[PDB]
Structure 1
Amino acid sequence: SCPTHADSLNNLANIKREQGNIEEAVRLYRKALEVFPEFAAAHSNLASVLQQQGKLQEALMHYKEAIRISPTFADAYSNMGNTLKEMQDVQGALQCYTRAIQINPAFADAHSNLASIHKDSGNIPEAIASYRTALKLKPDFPDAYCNLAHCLQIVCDWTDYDERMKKLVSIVADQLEKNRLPSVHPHHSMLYPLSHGFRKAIAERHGNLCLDKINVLHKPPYEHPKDLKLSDGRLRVGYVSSDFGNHPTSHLMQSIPGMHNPDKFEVFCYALSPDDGTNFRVKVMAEANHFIDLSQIPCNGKAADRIHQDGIHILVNMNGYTKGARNELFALRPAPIQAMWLGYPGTSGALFMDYIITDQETSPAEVAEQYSEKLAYMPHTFFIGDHANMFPHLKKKAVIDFKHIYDNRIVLNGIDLKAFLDSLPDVKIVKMKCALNMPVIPMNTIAEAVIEMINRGQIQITINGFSISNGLATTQINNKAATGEEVPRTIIVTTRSQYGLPEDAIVYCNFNQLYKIDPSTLQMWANILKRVPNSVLWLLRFPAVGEPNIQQYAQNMGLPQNRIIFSPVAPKEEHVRRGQLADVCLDTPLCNGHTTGMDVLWAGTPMVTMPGETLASRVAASQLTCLGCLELIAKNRQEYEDIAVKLGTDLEYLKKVRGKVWKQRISSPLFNTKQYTMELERLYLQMWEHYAAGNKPDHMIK
């Protein structure tokens, strides 16, 4: 019955949590609650560690209790909220946060938590509002400050940018030393000027967050195979992803499982997400030797066992710290070898991950410092894309003449393009020198009927019985094709006039999310635009609220509205296809276009880059050197501007480079998934031979 006894028990548990010894802390709290059952603070503390243990089920019940005892406990409401969120019950969580703020208007944390819900839903201005509220209520609040910082980044509010940055670094630096969990998310750490030392250290900590959740399960280490004997001479590779579906990851690697060689490899795909019923999911299920739906084995314990029973040699993590990740699986070390691949563009910083598949250009030897894993190099680039298979209609184009002869003002693509062109009277064939060429339809009645459709905004027309489609309406003609799930079965016209682009101008584009732009990147582009008098920059409303903001910072650098053009975001296929309309693509040096990189390159649109120091800023370079276009890679800001300007001012040079990209996307290794798969296989075998000979993981540079 004694609260004085119970009280000191609580103090003693609070001490075990300081020393990190969690399992003892729990025992004490439980006694404290057995001595005095109506003890608010204990229920609350016990709850907040059970939450840490991933025992959300029970943790919630104790929070409820604390609230029942002591109903003015705004702090418990807020934390109960966090618990509901993690249980996928957003509504319930939200009700808590609001309920708390009502009880204590002046309580900072609940406002911050509320803003975080808003962020997850994509409600950014609403998120900003609430973060700002929280920081007014409590001006030293790292979590809120950093989250705010990321929103501002997301919409390109660069108010006080340099201060902001200095203060972030300063906050992390403190939290790292003070030994707490840093407020900056690892996946974001790449956007700010932290030391590589810091980036790694942040990742470390999130790695450890896993270990806590698995010590609760008390599992013995697993027994890994030492030979390929039970697996019948075949090496067993498991791909683990929450993204077998309509997601970038699948748009890159969906062909790979199918292309593995069955004599030497047995392929297991472990889905962490439910079936969205898209073809991406269908294809992988149909081609992998074994498809396993782990989205229905939510206990990380049984899931790990399952992998271990399947007898996997190499387990590949395609998530890192993205949404859907379940790194607890990897932390349980069910495979002898575990590598990061493709999905997450940074180090995991964690002990349980052995290798990271990358390349010479992305991760040269000197910067080994910044990864916790050991480097495993692919021969060219570690990047890959399914464009060859997804969008073969863009393997060839044709143009309509209206005037000079331009490769990108009115464009036609289609599987049956050749057949249609032969139905036409007067088709001139422009040679592309140094087997290749681009047909040109002259301005007869037919061409006019096509512009007619475009200008009037109609869906489609018929010409000599061929089906001709408006590029903007693909989605209504055939939704599966618009998404990339099918190859289109009609001919598709794509024009600059559709997007309100000047017919007679140099078009620089960037199709990435706006968060990747910073004030230097923009300055740099302003520079280019000024020096290339009759040109525009083409950007996306990604998200839309970022547009007014960029327009502002552009006006401050002396650019009329006219000079930057924003299009809405488009379905995958349209997005890829309309890159054909640009002249050059300027790549964000803070954090490169990754998928976006492949997407412009597939369109045959040269892309200029300046490789930084983080992996995320070095990818476009890597893609380009693999393509074989070393003259599009700048060493510094000055040089980048020069390359861009030369391309805009020298129409002969442009045509040469454009033409060189158009050829090499086929001939280089870059979009060749078969060859890619094979190199990946060679690499796997090296990793295994090494482990089989009884060695610990170490760098692999051929």
Structure 2
Amino acid sequence: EEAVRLYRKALEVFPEFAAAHSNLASVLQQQGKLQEALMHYKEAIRISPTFADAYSNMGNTLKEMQDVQGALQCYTRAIQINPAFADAHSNLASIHKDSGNIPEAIASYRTALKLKPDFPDAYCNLAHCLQIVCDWTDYDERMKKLVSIVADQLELPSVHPHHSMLYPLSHGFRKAIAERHGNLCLDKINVLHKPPYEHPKDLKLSDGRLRVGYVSSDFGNHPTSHLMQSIPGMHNPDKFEVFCYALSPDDGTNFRVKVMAEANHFIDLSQIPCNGKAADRIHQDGIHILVNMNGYTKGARNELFALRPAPIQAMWLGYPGTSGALFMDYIITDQETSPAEVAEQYSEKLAYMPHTFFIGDHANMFPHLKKKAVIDFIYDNRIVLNGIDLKAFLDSLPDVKIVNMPVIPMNTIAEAVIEMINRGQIQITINGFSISNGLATTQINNKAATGEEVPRTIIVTTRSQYGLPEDAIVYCNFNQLYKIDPSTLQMWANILKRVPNSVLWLLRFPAVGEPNIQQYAQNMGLPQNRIIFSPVAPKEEHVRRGQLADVCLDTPLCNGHTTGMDVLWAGTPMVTMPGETLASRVAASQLTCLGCLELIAKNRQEYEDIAVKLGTDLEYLKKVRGKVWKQRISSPLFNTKQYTMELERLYLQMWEHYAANKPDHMI
């Protein structure tokens, strides 16, 4: 704030001061004034045409305005002017990173570190890049060094809170990191001189209904909607009123459509870009509990929560960690992910949901996967059929043997099916029905593939489509590869050597980490026929293809979150080893809810034993599969209604307390 005042006087004193133009421009760029910022930077450059530092900071602004090509020309021009300019290289690399050119990002990060060898920001950024591709050279050094960089800075931390969970920090360190990010949001809002807000201490203006405001930049196609899209419309209108605050433009999707149609009030904060004016509106709506569903994730506008427009402010489901900030009062969680014992990682108090804070709209979005049929030469997972009108088709058939899983005998029906898969042709007609190839969903109905529409054909899923073997156990992990580390790959390799008849199924997420994974795998005595890769698939293909797997091996470091509920939905047991950080206790929470305590491992030996057991004790696997396949329907896991209602109980609980006392832990 006072920097601005200074600089304008510096420019009052002296009209022609290139550095102070550039300095003014950088602080206007902090407080969001991108156009004005950009103007002063060109003044600086007009004064001094070889001002590398302006060009580099101009590029940053252009990147923030989403002018990516202009930011490119700016960074390059600063590197031309001064080829040993460390920041131009760091910044350049960060564009390459956001475009998914990680090899070219890594190169430019290196070049920075060579030029200015103590440059903490660029080290941590490179370290995340290395994580993304599963490059683990000097891995132990790296980790030891990131703890170091952070140790130092604490006395702004160069490791992002959404990253801090992947590295061996202390929980004091992870909290501390989030604490200095939350603090930075306050320093942004205090510029606005805003008086404190006067909060309802009553429900009388609201007609006896609790006003709950849900803020998310992901009401649209993003994992957030894929999990909670039915929550607003399932709220009880008699006792609650729902306000949805989108932080992003309408992305066009049926996910966005649902939330706008179903909420009682939908407010687009993307056109109220000023945080003061936007937090004014939240207060004017009269919100009682305002829920944060971003934490430190792409889109967040935590400044809205930094100004305090609601008496109660809660974190929920979009952020797998602490915000570290005193403007957030609760975190909605459960005892199985955030045990009372470990409450002191979290700056916020702990609000317990009764089973798992995690939800999924799979019940609603993929209901063609509630029931299945298989084709013969019996295996539940080699050649699979799913359809809304599957039953009708089965009953159109001469012969079918229900074991309850219907089974199609190998006839001229099953020949035309498997030859479709064989040719890679899109679809066929049998008895007037659509029989469609699972590899071709986007061709047939795009919105079906994205999960915007339930599919309206019968879809065929086979291991042959993925190059999975028809006579061997399949392990999968379907996450982004960044969550695999050395230890984890070691565990999987162990399992793979005890179970000779097996393949571990991974994805090119990204494909540029595949050679690494396989290299490191082969250092552990594992041939290249053993780990299979296939590409990332459009949403519905993903969830469907989990049917081909036998068992899914969860990443202990950071669990499948969305990816977890995805695999459970296909009827595939997941083996997890819950760690310490909330991101490592999720798959375990989901399984406690689902009711498979048998799949939750206490340590590595336990983990590997569980999964080797599952891959050799075949009837134990038929037992466990059977148990998961029924319990996804019969347990609270996928039950958005039970979820919403119990969530409603927890909110009233939070109101009653504030109605009297200050925020305190919830059971």
Q: Considering the TM-score relative to the shorter chain, is it more than 0.5?
A: yes
- 1:52 is paired with a residue of what secondary structure? coil
- 1:447-491 Cα offsets, whole Å, 9 max, x none, are 112111111111111111121111111111111111111111111
**1:90/1:208 CA distance change after superposition, 3 Å:** farther
Instruction: Return the offset for 1:201.
Output: 1.1
- 1:48-82 Cα offsets, whole Å, 9 max, x none, are 33333333343333323222223332122212222
Q: Is the 8 A contact 1:510 1:585 kept in 2?
A: yes
- 1:525-550 Cα offsets, whole Å, 9 max, x none, are 00000001101100001000111111
- 1:466-521 Cα offsets, whole Å, 9 max, x none, are 21111111111111111111111111111000101100100000000000000100
Instruction: Return the offset for 1:327.
Output: 0.9
Instruction: Return the offset for 1:33.
Output: 2.1
5 Å matches for 1:570-581? 570-581=537-548
- 2:620 is paired with a residue of what secondary structure? helix
5 Å matches for 1:422-571? 422-430=395-403, 437-571=404-538
Q: Is the 8 A contact 1:524 1:641 kept in 2?
A: yes
Q: Is the 8 A contact 1:340 1:357 kept in 2?
A: yes
- Asked if 1:108 is matched to 2:86, the reply is yes
From 151, 164, 182, give the equivalent of 1:173.
151
- Asked if 1:268 is matched to 2:243, the reply is yes
Instruction: Return the offset for 1:360.
Output: 0.4
Aligned residues: 667
Instruction: Return the offset for 1:640.
Output: 0.1
Instruction: Return the offset for 1:139.
Output: 1.2
Instruction: Return the offset for 1:24.
Output: 3.7
- For 1:288 and 1:28, locate their aligned partners in 2 and report how far apart those are by CA, in whole Å: 47
2:561 aligns with 594
Instruction: Return the offset for 1:683.
Output: 0.5
- 1:172-192 Cα offsets, whole Å, 9 max, x none, are 111111xxx111111111101
Instruction: Return the offset for 1:249.
Output: 0.5
**1:25/1:417 CA distance change after superposition, 3 Å:** closer
- 1:499 is paired with a residue of what secondary structure? coil
Instruction: Return the offset for 1:194.
Output: 0.7
Q: Is the 8 A contact 1:169 1:193 kept in 2?
A: yes
- For 2:50 and 2:598, locate their aligned partners in 1 and report how far apart those are by CA, in whole Å: 66
Instruction: Return the offset for 1:29.
Output: 2.9
Instruction: Return the offset for 1:118.
Output: 1.0
- For 1:27 and 1:467, locate their aligned partners in 2 and report how far apart those are by CA, in whole Å: 70
From 210, 216, 238, give the equivalent of 2:213.
238
Q: Is the 8 A contact 1:632 1:643 kept in 2?
A: yes
- For 2:594 and 2:254, locate their aligned partners in 1 and report how far apart those are by CA, in whole Å: 29
- 1:377-417 Cα offsets, whole Å, 9 max, x none, are 10000000000001111001111111xx1111011111111
- 2:609 is paired with a residue of what secondary structure? helix
- 1:262-287 Cα offsets, whole Å, 9 max, x none, are 00001010111111111111111111
Instruction: Return the offset for 1:42.
Output: 2.3
- 1:383 is paired with a residue of what secondary structure? coil
- 1:192-216 Cα offsets, whole Å, 9 max, x none, are 1111111111111111221122122
From 617, 621, 625, give the equivalent of 2:588.
621
Instruction: Return the offset for 1:355.
Output: 0.8
- For 1:536 and 1:499, locate their aligned partners in 2 and report how far apart those are by CA, in whole Å: 12
- 2:165 is paired with a residue of what secondary structure? helix
- 2:351 is paired with a residue of what secondary structure? strand
- For 1:310 and 1:164, locate their aligned partners in 2 and report how far apart those are by CA, in whole Å: 48
Deviates more, 1:417-426 or 1:522-531: 417-426
Q: Is the 8 A contact 1:587 1:593 kept in 2?
A: yes
- 1:675-695 Cα offsets, whole Å, 9 max, x none, are 0000100000011111111x2
Instruction: Return the offset for 1:98.
Output: 0.9
1:649 aligns with 616
Instruction: Return the offset for 1:522.
Output: 0.1
- For 1:124 and 1:189, locate their aligned partners in 2 and report how far apart those are by CA, in whole Å: 20
Instruction: Return the offset for 1:47.
Output: 3.0
Instruction: Return the offset for 1:136.
Output: 1.2
1:193 aligns with 168
- For 1:615 and 1:160, locate their aligned partners in 2 and report how far apart those are by CA, in whole Å: 27
- For 1:175 and 1:99, locate their aligned partners in 2 and report how far apart those are by CA, in whole Å: 31
Instruction: Return the offset for 1:93.
Output: 2.0
| CA RMSD of superposed structures (Å) | 1.1
Instruction: Return the offset for 1:168.
Output: 0.7
- 2:145 is paired with a residue of what secondary structure? helix
- For 1:556 and 1:89, locate their aligned partners in 2 and report how far apart those are by CA, in whole Å: 44
- 1:128-152 Cα offsets, whole Å, 9 max, x none, are 1111111111111111111000001
- For 1:415 and 1:26, locate their aligned partners in 2 and report how far apart those are by CA, in whole Å: 62
Deviates more, 1:63-72 or 1:212-221: 63-72
- 1:7-45 Cα offsets, whole Å, 9 max, x none, are xxxxxxxxxxxxxxxx44443333222112222332233
- 1:507 is paired with a residue of what secondary structure? strand
5 Å matches for 1:299-310? 299-310=274-285
**1:449/1:24 CA distance change after superposition, 3 Å:** closer
Deviates more, 1:384-393 or 1:207-216: 207-216
Q: Is the 8 A contact 1:555 1:561 kept in 2?
A: yes
Instruction: Return the offset for 1:220.
Output: 1.3
- 1:54 is paired with a residue of what secondary structure? coil
- For 1:26 and 1:373, locate their aligned partners in 2 and report how far apart those are by CA, in whole Å: 34
- For 1:169 and 1:517, locate their aligned partners in 2 and report how far apart those are by CA, in whole Å: 19
- For 1:493 and 1:86, locate their aligned partners in 2 and report how far apart those are by CA, in whole Å: 44
Q: Is the 8 A contact 1:339 1:356 kept in 2?
A: yes
Deviates more, 1:501-510 or 1:450-459: 450-459
Q: Is the 8 A contact 1:227 1:692 kept in 2?
A: yes
**1:305/1:261 CA distance change after superposition, 3 Å:** same
- 1:93-129 Cα offsets, whole Å, 9 max, x none, are 2221111111001111100000011111111111111
- For 1:43 and 1:366, locate their aligned partners in 2 and report how far apart those are by CA, in whole Å: 53
- 1:615-671 Cα offsets, whole Å, 9 max, x none, are 001100000000010010101011100000001011011110010000100111000
Q: Is the 8 A contact 1:84 1:92 kept in 2?
A: yes
TM-score of the two chains, using structure 2 as the length reference: 0.98
- Asked if 1:213 is matched to 2:188, the reply is yes
5 Å matches for 1:34-183? 34-177=12-155, 181-183=156-158
- For 1:254 and 1:506, locate their aligned partners in 2 and report how far apart those are by CA, in whole Å: 35
- 2:61 is paired with a residue of what secondary structure? helix
- For 1:183 and 1:362, locate their aligned partners in 2 and report how far apart those are by CA, in whole Å: 27
Q: Is the 8 A contact 1:54 1:213 kept in 2?
A: no
- 1:226-245 Cα offsets, whole Å, 9 max, x none, are 11101000001111111111
Query: What 5-or-longer segments of structure 1 have no aligned partner?
Result: 1-22, 431-436
- 1:438 is paired with a residue of what secondary structure? coil
- 2:72 is paired with a residue of what secondary structure? helix
- For 2:260 and 2:14, locate their aligned partners in 1 and report how far apart those are by CA, in whole Å: 55
Deviates more, 1:69-78 or 1:500-509: 69-78
Matched residues, percent identical? 100
- For 2:478 and 2:578, locate their aligned partners in 1 and report how far apart those are by CA, in whole Å: 18
Q: Is the 8 A contact 1:52 1:212 kept in 2?
A: no
- For 1:342 and 1:370, locate their aligned partners in 2 and report how far apart those are by CA, in whole Å: 17
Q: Is the 8 A contact 1:115 1:131 kept in 2?
A: yes
Q: Is the 8 A contact 1:53 1:212 kept in 2?
A: no
Instruction: Return the offset for 1:354.
Output: 1.0
- 1:371 is paired with a residue of what secondary structure? coil
- For 2:46 and 2:179, locate their aligned partners in 1 and report how far apart those are by CA, in whole Å: 38
- 1:292-343 Cα offsets, whole Å, 9 max, x none, are 1111111112111111111111111111111111111111111111111011
- 1:581-604 Cα offsets, whole Å, 9 max, x none, are 100000000100000000000000
1:354 aligns with 329
